[PDB]
Each structure stands twice: as C-alpha cells, then as structure tokens.
Design a protein around this ligand. Structure first.
Ligand code: SF4
Ligand code: F3S
Lengths: 72, 382, 144, 156, 445
C-alpha cells in the first residue's frame, strides 16, 4: 500500500497547489507585500505539510482496510 | 593499481590544471575553492558520520565504519593543498585589499570597527591553522585508534573513541560554523546569515554519506567482496540519505523562504546569483535535480536498498555538490558572464580523484574491514 | 487596513519597523457616553476590540473625492483632497498631492534633493518619502 | 460566467488599437509641443514632464501584447479578461489623463487662463443641491478633448 | 541489553494492569484537585479576558504578544519531544524508546491542546477565527497563505492529528490487551465493550507487517512534519524584518529548543512517575542516562547559536542588529539573558560529570531549571528584540500583569489535568513493543 500511498501524496499536493493557483492569483488575489501570487516558497510549508495530513490518513485508511481491521 | 589510477589521472589532471594557476589566473583560484572545500566537506561529512555512529551507538552499520575513518586523514593532506588559496587570498575575499577601511579611497566600507578584528589576513592564517590542530587531531586520535583496535585490541576498545566524542565532539560543530563563516560567508561580505554555518555542515554530511555508500556499492561489484556487506546495511544508508536530505533542504530552503521574503540588503547574494546571468537556470535545475529526484527515486522500499542504484546515486548525489557549491563560490566573478570555464571542472574531477587516490592508498596500506571488532559478526550475520 | 477582517493576533504590528499598527486593545467605544458620540464623524468605521488600525493616509477623504470623480469623469486636482495631517499642520509641511501627477506639490517636494527616506535600507520602498531638517548654524563671528 | 473568454477578446483588442492610434498622437503632439512652445515657458523640466509619460505609454504597448497573449493563449479562465481589460482601460485612461494634466499647463502659461474648457469643474459634494454631477459629466464629455488638447492650442 | 528487568512477556501485563485495574488512588484525588484548580484559574481568567479585552494581559503595542504566544512556543516546543522519540528512535531504530514512548505522545498531545488554545485566545476576536480556515465561506473570501500564523493553524491542526493518530495507532495492542482482560479479569464486563478501539484486533500476520511499515511511515512522515511544525512556529518570528528575528539559524535553533525543553519536562514526569508509581524493572535508570545525551546535544547546539547571534552582532550586522543583542545582555533584561544562557549552558556543561549524572533526584531539580530558561528563551528571543527595534520611539519595557501569570500557571494546570486524565485510563508504557524488542522475542534461542 505504498502504491496506495500514491494517491495520498498526489491529492494533498494537488490540493494545496490547487488551493493557490485557484486562490492567490485567479480568484480574489491581493497585492499583499508584493508577494507574487503563490510563488512556491511560502506555499512549500503547506504544499509539504498539508500533504502530510491528507497523505498520512490515507496511509492509515489502508491500515484500517487490510482485511478490514474493524471486525470485532 | 586500484590506488594510483584516481591519483595518477587526477594528479595528472591537477598538474595539467597548473595551467589554471598560470593562465586565466583569477578563475582557477576559485575553481580551486569549489573543489578544495568539496574535498573538505567530504572530510567533514564522513567524519561526522563516524561521530554520530558512536554517540548514540549503532552496531548495525559498522561494516561501513572503518572506511569513513580512512577518509579523514585526507584533511592533513588538505593542509598542503591550502597553498593555492594563499597566493590568491589577497585577490579573493575583498577585505584583504586594505585600500578600503579608512585609506584615501572613495570607499569607507563599514568594516573598520566591525569586522577588522575578526578578519585580518594573518588572523585568517590562525583561524584555519587552528582547525588543523583539531580536525586532524581527531584523525591522529581516531584513525590511529580505530585502525589499531584490530591488531592491538584494547581492554577499553570503543570508550577511547567515545572520549573523542566526549570533548572532541562539540569543538567540531563550532569550527565548522566559523569555518563557513570565514571561507564562504566572505566572498560577498555584504551579507549576514546565521544559518549558513550549517548549510556548509549539512551540505557536507549530506554528501559524504553518499560517497561512503557508493564506495561499497562500487567495491561490492567486482570488488574484494560481493556479499559480505548485506543489503539491509544500505537500507539504513537510505534512511540516512533521506533524514539528511531533509536536514539539507530544510536548510537550503530556510535560507531561501526567509530571504525570499524580507528582501533586505543582505539579499544581494541572490539578486546577482539566483535570477540574473544564467543561474535561475541553475537553481531550478538544481532543486529539481538535487532534492526531488533523490527524494522520489530512492523512496519506495522495493529497490531503495539495492547496491548499484545507491552507488549510481552517489554520483548524482555528489557530482551535484559542484552544482550546489558553484552556486556559491564562483558566481561572484561570473556575475557579469555566466560562462563556466574548462578550469571550473578540471579541479572537480581532479581533487575528487586526488582525495580518492590517498583514500585507496591507505586502504592499500592496511585493512579494509576491521579484522576484529565488537559486534562485527552481529552486523555481518545480520 | 480593514477594521473588520482582522482578528487581533497583532503580528501585523510586530513586523513593521515603525510600530504604528496600533490595536484596539480594550473596547473604549462601548463605554463611550451618550455625549461624545455626536463627535465621531459619520463617515468612517469606528472599531471594536481585537482589531488593528493605522494612518491610512486619511483615506476617508480619498474615497469621497475619488468617488466624486467616478460619478463625473475627471482627475483629482492638486488640492481637491487634503488630509488631516496636511490641512491642520499650519506649517505647510505635509503636501500629500498624488504621485504620478507631476504638476502637484508632492512631485516638486519629492524631486527635491533631500527625499529623506526613513529606514529605506530595509528595501521596503515606501511612500511618504519625506524631507530632512536643515539646521542653519552661523559663520564664526565668535560663535563657538 | 457567461460563455468563456473568447467573447471579451474582441473588446480588449478594441482597447489596444486605441493605444496604437495614440502612439501616433502622443508622439505627434510631442513634436507639436516642441514646435508650439519653443521658448514661451521654462520648458526644461516641463517638456520632459511630457516625455516621462511617453516612455511608459510605449512600454505598455509591448505589455498589452503580453497581457493579451496570456489571455488568448488559453481561453478557459474568465477571471483574467475582465482584469486585463480593467488594467488596460486604467493604464490607458491614466495616460490619457496624465497627458492632459501636463497639457493643460501649456495653455495655463500661453494663455493666462487655464481655460473654462479645462475639466468638468463641477465642485464639491455639497454643491450638488445646485449642480448634480450628471450635468457636469455631460459638460466634460461633450466639451473636453482627451488628446485634442494641444492641437486645440494650434487654434490659439 | 537496554532494559534492566527480571521480566518475561507476561510480567508486564499483570503490572500495567495493576496500574489500570482498579479505581482508588488518593494522590490522584489531590492532583485532579490542584490541577483542575489550575485549569479553573485558566478559564477563570480566559473568559474574563474575552468578555473584556486583550489589554488585561501586559502587552504594549511594540511587544504585542507577551507571555501567551511565548507559552505557545513553550507548550508546543515541549511537545515535540514525545512524538520524535516515537519517530526518530525508530528511524535510527535504536530499539531503546520502548520503555517510555507511549507516555510521550500524551506529553505531546496535551501540550498541543494547551498550546493551540493560545492562538485561539491571544487574539482579541476569537469568534472570528474560522475565517482563518480555508472554508468556502459566506462570501468569496479565503485566508492568506503567506502568513506563518496560518501555517501554525494547519500545522497544529495536523500535528494534533498526526501525533494523535500515530499515538492512537501506537496503543492498539494495549486496547487489545485491555479488551482481552476486561472479560476474564478487569474492571467490568462492559470495559470490553468500551475497548472497541481495538478495532477487531487479533495480532495477526496479515496486518501486523502493515503496522510495522505504517509505524515506519509515520516515523519518516511525522518527523518531516515535526521539523516543519516548530519550524513554522519559528518561521513566524524569523520571516520578519526584526534584527533579532531575521537571523536565519532560528528554525533549527528553536527546534533544538523544543528538544531541550521537551525532554526537560519528560524527565520531570518520569522522576515522579518513578518514585511512587514507578517501573524500576522497565523504566531503567540507564534509560534516563542515555536520554540526557540528546538533551545535552541540544545543551550545546542551542549554545552554538547564541554564539552566532552574539557573533554576527560583531560580524557584518546592521547597526541595529549590533544593538539588538547588546540589549539582550546589557539592558532591562540582564536578569534574563545573563542568567538564562548561563542557566541553559552551565547546567548542561555542569551535567556531564558522573557519567551523565545517573542520579535520579538531581534530575528533577535540574530538569526544571533547564526548562525555566526555555520559558525565558522565548520570552527573550521574541520580546527582547521586539522592543528596541529600529526606533527609539518604540522603546517600552514589558510589564506582565497578574493575569499573564495565572494563564502560564493554568497551562501547567490543564496540562497535568488532562495528561493525568487519559494517562490513568490508557496504559503508560508502550507494553506492546517492550516485551517484543529487547527480551527473548528474538528467534535466536
Ligand atoms: S491625519 Fe495623517 S496620520 Fe492621521 S490617520 Fe489621517 S492621514 Fe493618517
Ligand atoms: S496580522 Fe493581520 S489578521 Fe489582523 S491583527 Fe494584524 S492585520
């Protein structure tokens, strides 16, 4: 299920990176400090870190799915 | 022989690169720095590998222990290779010019009461010649020891190596910081950054993990061994190459997002390096080629531990430090014209051969794997 | 600044070299009586606890002017708008006329030699590029 | 978001052509101003006061291609045409307005009166009980020239 | 060997059961009194706050922050210790963490709770903080992702989660053990029905291998997050233009502060979790011995940065950054920095004497004092360069109010209050891996 961790990183990565190409420039932009509209660096600790959450939980949704652990 | 081919081809090439010190003069001194400090980072990185192997002691990666120790005694040879800097030292750091503090020049660069105590080129002599009394002393106190627990086994075998790690440990991390603050901080001294003492450190211990790793990966295939050092040894080296690629890119990016934000005068490292003059090319193709291709390719544990890949990575993982460090050392000259010269590379393949010349000649001088050692078969029978 | 959207984490202020992002610490206006309330002018956003605030160049009278120029096509004159720091300072120190309008007083007072740029060194590129003082001592004349 | 980007791409072209036709007019006036007020005024900052806009106006032409080509390259994002058009018309009407403010001073010295055909000249907001601005915008539009301001001074 | 205990695989279960078997402690009844009283003082002043306004804390405008966010960096820096000895010690696979691990993400997760309250509450407008989240809200508005105060939210709203989910997953064999005991020997027949957090556990091959690679995953996937959480909470400082902050070494530094803070509290918990309710056979004193190295690592890595700070003032500083650190030593806070740096440097360089000072009672009197400098470290670094920054006009001392201190105290209150609460319910020790790692679980017998 690292091959199932595939979809964890991509969607979260795409989520943040889509949470800014949709947000920082195209829909309600702002000249906050001349920041050039979702230039990579201040997006990295979200395009990195928010990926970790949505990619870890899928990493554990697998864990709760291998022979479906919730079978008390 | 195995020892003289990287040496004769590299010193054959280094003696050829005397042409640099003679012709296109100021170019070669600083292609020598990017090469010289790489050999130093190789010394610096793989030594810290030995240290951390002893502090939180690790009997699991010990077949890959004796060989770093060989790498260290380079740095005494790296002393006599400090010479080409010194003739060009008055031409490089821009504070050695001494026509600037309060002489008749139009410039009173604010260096008079601030820096002139820390930097005065006879002080620079001792600020590094002092380090030769430490980073070599580790060699003459560690390499003399760890080679010697084989033939003359001690009652207290490791705990003398620990003694180096008990008081010879912290001075290392200090002298690495001040070294970087003395060598590579100073090319564009209109810059003040506290992290960069670690970017040199981590960017060293980043690399040398790879060179130690690829050596076995080379010396496992058609080497003196082929199956002794098992696969899950390298499985840890991957876990290290990730855990220290993080400790690099965390640093190479904390140097970036922090300075990409504020836009201060200290930024002028990168108004000249990053964007302009054929180096936005460098940084992009660097970071795509320096963090993500390693962090992506090595990741899955179905070929992460294979020898020949991680050996193939040690090439892409250490040849790239040229591209990492050529983004620091040389650009203050070719700030006008990004035209990297042939002399930029002769010293890379030179010193990366010359260091390895000595590195095999010492492994020719004596053993390879410690003939007796604590927990050896515990790591071999693994 | 918008006195609505803020929340009061105050790190709006801590960045600025000039600690001018003041902050409505307590709710002074809620306890304001039934007398002074005549005085707060009926054109600007009085502010609630947990909110920053700053100069804004007296934006309020930019708006009623620029709006009055959006109704009817026009520019803004050299003196159609006067800020409070301008219109009150009897020494005609502050001028405020719009930059990129070369006939106005600001472009003459900015193009002057001493465009004193206070803590410019932080690469901040601000407006109100104001002027220094020129104290004028005396030739010797047995001064010292 | 009615029907995509390709609809607005006709009017954004219709703005850039107004700019291109004004390259002629502004640079034409820049000849005429050197001809009209040869020596009838200071003219040392005041002529360059008119040129300083001109390097910006021409600079925006190459941009207005780049602005526009970034739109016509991909017509699948409505939130760039309204903005590029709102930028052009502002970066256009500004430069029209900046030409005028430098050009009305020309009459202000040649004529002792900056003329009563200068601006809307309506008044403050409390002067709406007498004069709504509605009247004024039909004075300003139907009297004031955008860039027939100095050719008007050929009649003087 | 790395645990000293005459144990077998069974000997832990009877013992940790006796630590969760019956509900009649007395010292509990005192701790839940004084600690909850601490929590009562917290909310007694924290809703007194929001009905009234921020300025009852001692914050002037130049130093807008004061003790609350100082305590946020504290009560999150304190917490990284717990999650990283779960992650790091598996990455290096030192096979050593097992005696303490499961009690540590507790020591993280509750710290993160009493941490996260501060960003929700040192603001003045708490109710309007859901705007900070990226919900498609009632208008076309969304937050600003160039703001480390927002990174903090996602980080902590991920770090509360990942550390939890990595702790909850960490303690599955406990619930299996306790679900298994609740039927045959335990509190009630209806503790089994409470232990459905076992999630159909049987300890099988098919999913235990997966548990290992997941525990590997979260180790190599929460450490890259831990190095981003506290780094974010350092980025908020150093991203600024302030000279005492913009120095770029801070994110590694504050992380080392989180080490040198967090283990400086874990030892305070382990000492008192070793005297009365202790595990002599499982919490081997040799563990705390090899524990204080990674403290003493940051007992000097923290120290090297002070040199760099104190150095760059002499090397190539702005004429303000030159003054920024002369302030720290010489000025109002000479009581802090001279003693703080000395406190955080003397005691670690006075620590390694008698083979790391295995002696247990010195641990408590030192682990406090090591930590008190941390609350100063973040009261110094934040504030000592936040006044006296680029103007004399913005020169103002920071007088902390009597409500600043009851929130600090209350943070200890809710920490102990809720750390003790689940701790008495869950098992303390990571009993699953303890009997699986060092004892005769090895197939070589
Ligand atoms: S008077 Fe000046 S300083 Fe005061 S708010 Fe208005 S514009 Fe700002
Ligand atoms: S940082 Fe921002 S959210 Fe408000 S309190 Fe300051 S303007």
């Amino acid at each position: 299920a690292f091959i199932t961790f595939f979809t964890g990183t991509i969607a979260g990565f795409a989520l943040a990176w889509w949470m800014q190409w949709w947000m920082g420039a195209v829909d309600y932009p702002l000249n906050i400090s001349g920041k050039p509209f979702f230039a990579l660096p201040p997006s990295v600790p979200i395009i990195f870190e928010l990926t970790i959450l949505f990619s870890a939980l899928a990493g554990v949704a697998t864990m709760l799915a291998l022979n479906g652990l919730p079978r008390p | 022989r195995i020892w003289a081919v990287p040496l004769a081809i590299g010193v054959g090439l280094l003696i050829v690169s005397l042409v640099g010190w003679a012709i296109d003069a100021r170019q070669f001194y600083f292609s020598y720095l990017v090469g010289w400090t790489f050999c130093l980072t190789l010394a610096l990185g793989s030594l810290f590998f030995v240290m951390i192997q002893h502090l939180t002691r690790a009997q699991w990666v010990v077949a890959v222990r004796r060989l770093p120790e060989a790498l260290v005694w380079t740095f005494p040879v790296l002393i006599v290779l400090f010479i080409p800097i010194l003739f060009g030292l008055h031409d490089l750091y821009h504070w050695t010019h001494h026509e600037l503090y309060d002489p008749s020049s139009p410039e009173y660069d604010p260096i008079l009461a601030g820096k002139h105590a820390y930097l005065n080129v006879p002080f620079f002599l001792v600020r590094i010649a002092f380090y030769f009394f430490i980073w070599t002393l580790l060699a003459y106190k560690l390499y003399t020891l760890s080679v010697r627990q084989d033939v003359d086994p001690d009652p207290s075998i490791p705990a003398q190596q620990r003694k180096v790690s008990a008081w010879g440990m912290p001075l290392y991390g200090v002298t690495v910081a001040f070294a970087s603050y003395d060598f590579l901080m100073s090319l564009d001294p209109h810059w003040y950054s506290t992290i960069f003492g670690v970017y040199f450190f981590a960017g060293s211990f980043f690399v040398a993990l790879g060179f130690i790793t690829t050596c076995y990966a080379i010396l496992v295939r058609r080497g003196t061994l082929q199956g002794i050092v098992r696969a899950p040894h390298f499985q840890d080296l991957g876990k290290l190459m990730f855990g220290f690629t993080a400790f690099w890119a965390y640093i190479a990016f904390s140097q970036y997002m922090l300075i990409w934000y504020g836009n201060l005068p200290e930024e002028t490292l990168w108004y000249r390096h990053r964007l302009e003059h054929g180096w936005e090319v460098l940084s992009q193709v660097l970071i795509w080629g320096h963090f993500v291709l390693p962090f992506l390719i090595l990741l899955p544990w179905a070929a992460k531990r294979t020898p020949v890949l991680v050996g193939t990575m040690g090439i892409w993982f250490a040849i790239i430090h040229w591209i990492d460090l050529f983004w620091v050392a040389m650009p203050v000259l070719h700030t006008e014209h990004m035209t990297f010269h042939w002399l930029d590379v002769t010293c890379w393949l030179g010193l990366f051969g010359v260091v390895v010349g000595l590195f095999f000649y010492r492994i020719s001088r004596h053993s390879l794997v410690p003939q007796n050692d604590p927990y050896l078969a515990r790591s071999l029978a693994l | 600044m918008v006195y609505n959207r803020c929340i009061g984490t105050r790190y709006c202020s801590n960045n600025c070299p000039y600690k001018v992002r003041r902050f409505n610490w307590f709710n002074w206006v809620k306890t304001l009586p039934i007398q002074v309330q005549m005085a707060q002018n009926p054109d600007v956003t009085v502010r609630f606890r947990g909110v920053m605030e700053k100069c804004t160049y007296c934006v309020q009278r930019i708006r009623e002017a620029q709006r009055q120029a959006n109704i009817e096509k026009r520019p803004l004159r050299d003196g159609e708008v006067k800020t409070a720091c301008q219109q009150a300072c009897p020494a005609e120190a502050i001028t405020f006329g719009d930059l990129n309008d070369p006939n106005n007083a600001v472009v003459k007072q900015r193009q002057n030699a001493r465009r004193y740029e206070m803590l410019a060194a932080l690469n901040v590129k601000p407006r109100t590029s104001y002027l220094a003082r020129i104290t004028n001592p005396n030739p010797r004349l047995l001064e010292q | 978001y009615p029907g995509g980007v390709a609809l607005t791409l006709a009017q954004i072209e219709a703005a850039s052509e107004q700019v291109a036709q004004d390259l002629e007019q502004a640079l034409a006036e820049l000849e005429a101003l050197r001809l009209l007020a040869r020596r009838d005024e200071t003219l040392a900052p005041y002529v360059a006061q008119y040129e300083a806009i001109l390097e910006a106006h021409q600079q925006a032409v190459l941009e207005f291609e780049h602005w526009k080509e970034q739109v016509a390259a991909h017509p699948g994002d409505y939130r760039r045409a309204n903005r590029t058009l709102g930028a052009i018309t502002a970066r256009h009407e500004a430069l029209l307005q900046q030409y005028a403010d430098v050009a009305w001073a020309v009459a202000q010295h040649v004529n002792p009166a900056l003329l009563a055909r200068a601006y809307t000249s309506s008044g403050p907001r409390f002067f709406f009980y007498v004069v709504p601005p509605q009247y004024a915008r039909q004075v300003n539009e139907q009297a004031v020239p955008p860039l027939q301001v100095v050719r008007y001074l050929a009649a003087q | 060997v790395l645990v000293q205990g005459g144990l077998t695989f069974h000997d832990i279960t009877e013992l940790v059961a006796q630590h969760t078997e019956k509900k009649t402690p007395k010292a509990w009844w005192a701790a839940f009194s004084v600690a909850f009283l601490g929590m009562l003082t917290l909310v007694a002043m924290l809703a007194y706050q929001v009905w009234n306004g921020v300025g009852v804390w001692g914050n002037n405008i130049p130093v807008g922050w004061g003790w609350p966010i100082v305590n946020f960096v504290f009560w999150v820096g304190i917490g990284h210790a717990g999650t990283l000895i779960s992650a790091i010690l598996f990455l290096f696979r030192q096979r050593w963490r097992t005696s303490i691990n499961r009690a540590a993400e507790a020591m993280t997760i509750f710290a993160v709770i009493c941490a996260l309250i501060f960003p929700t509450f040192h603001v003045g407008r708490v109710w309007a903080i859901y705007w900070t989240l990226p919900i498609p809200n009632q208008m076309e508005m969304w937050p600003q992702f160039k703001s480390p105060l927002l990174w903090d939210v996602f980080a902590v709203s991920s770090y509360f989660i990942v550390s939890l989910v990595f702790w909850y997953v960490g303690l599955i064999p406990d619930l299996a053990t306790l679900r298994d005991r609740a039927a045959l020997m335990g509190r009630r027949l209806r503790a089994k029905i409470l232990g459905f957090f076992a999630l159909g556990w049987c300890g099988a091959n098919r999913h235990w291998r997966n548990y290992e690679k997941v525990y590997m995953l979260l180790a190599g996937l929460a450490t890259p997050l831990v190095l981003s959480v506290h780094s974010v909470v350092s980025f908020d400082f150093a991203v600024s233009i302030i000279p005492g902050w913009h120095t770029t070494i801070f994110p590694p530094y504050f992380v080392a502060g989180a080490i040198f803070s967090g283990f400086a509290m874990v030892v305070t918990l382990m000492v008192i979790a070793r005297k009365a309710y202790g595990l002599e056979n499982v919490i081997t004193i040799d563990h705390l011995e090899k524990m204080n190295i990674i403290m003493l690592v940051t007992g000097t890595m923290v120290g090297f940065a002070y040199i760099t700070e104190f150095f760059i003032a002499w090397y190539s500083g702005v004429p303000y950054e030159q003054y920024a650190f002369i302030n720290r030593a010489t000025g109002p806070y000479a009581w802090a920095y001279w003693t703080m740096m000395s406190c955080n440097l003397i005691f670690p360089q006075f620590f390694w004497i008698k083979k790391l000072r295995r002696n247990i009672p010195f641990m408590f009197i030192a682990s406090i004092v090591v930590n008190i400098g941390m609350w100063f470290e973040r009261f110094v670094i934040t504030i000592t360069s936040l006044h006296r920054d680029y103007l004399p006009s913005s020169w103002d001392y920071f007088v902390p109010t009597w409500v600043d201190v009851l929130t600090l105290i209350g943070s200890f209150g809710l920490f102990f209050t809720l750390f003790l609460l689940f701790l008495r319910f869950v098992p303390m020790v990571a009993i699953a891996e303890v009997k699986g790692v060092l004892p005769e679980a090895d197939p070589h017998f």
